Design a protein around this nucleic acid. Structure first.
Lengths: 29, 70
RNA sequence: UCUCGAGCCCUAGACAGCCGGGAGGUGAGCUUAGAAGCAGCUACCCUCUAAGAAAAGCGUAACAGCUUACCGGCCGAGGUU
């Protein structure tokens, strides 16, 4: 549950709003 | 292309050789404006998009020589 | 080789392997005829970025070149102390 993985997803989700697992994670929201 | 930073500083600095110890032994000074110009002489040799960042790059060698700012 | 225990990492993909990336300012400054990660001394900063040292180990007359760190992929279950 590293915090950097949690901050990454939120950062990715932020870009989409305007690692593959992390991308899937973000796109999954 | 455009000459490297190292010299471009010593030109608008008035000196020739860096001190024995950087940031510790201040050799010269540079106004913020002065750094805004060099950041233009090297518009290609750098990766920055805005002139802001370009400065940070240039404003990296300085303090690590004794080149204070005002 | 068998048995027991503790810490930490892991399907948000660990450990290892293999493939790809390892980039700009900038050959840092000083020293020096020259030294550019890698003689010595000092500093060791910031851009682009998913990463990438002012460079850990070779290598060179000095470069070159080969790799480590670091990131990504393939893989899929324990791994490490």
């Amino acid at each position: 549950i590293p915090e950097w993985k949690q901050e990454e997803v939120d950062a990715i989700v932020e870009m989409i709003e305007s690692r593959n697992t992390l991308l899937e994670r973000a796109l999954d929201d | 292309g455009v000459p490297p930073t190292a010299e471009l500083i010593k030109d608008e600095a008035g000196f020739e050789t860096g001190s024995g110890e950087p940031q510790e032994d201040f050799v010269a000074d540079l106004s913020v404006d002065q750094v805004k110009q060099i950041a233009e002489q090297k518009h290609p040799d750098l990766l920055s998009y805005d002139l802001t960042n370009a400065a940070k790059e240039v404003v990296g060698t300085c303090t690590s020589l004794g080149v204070t700012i005002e």
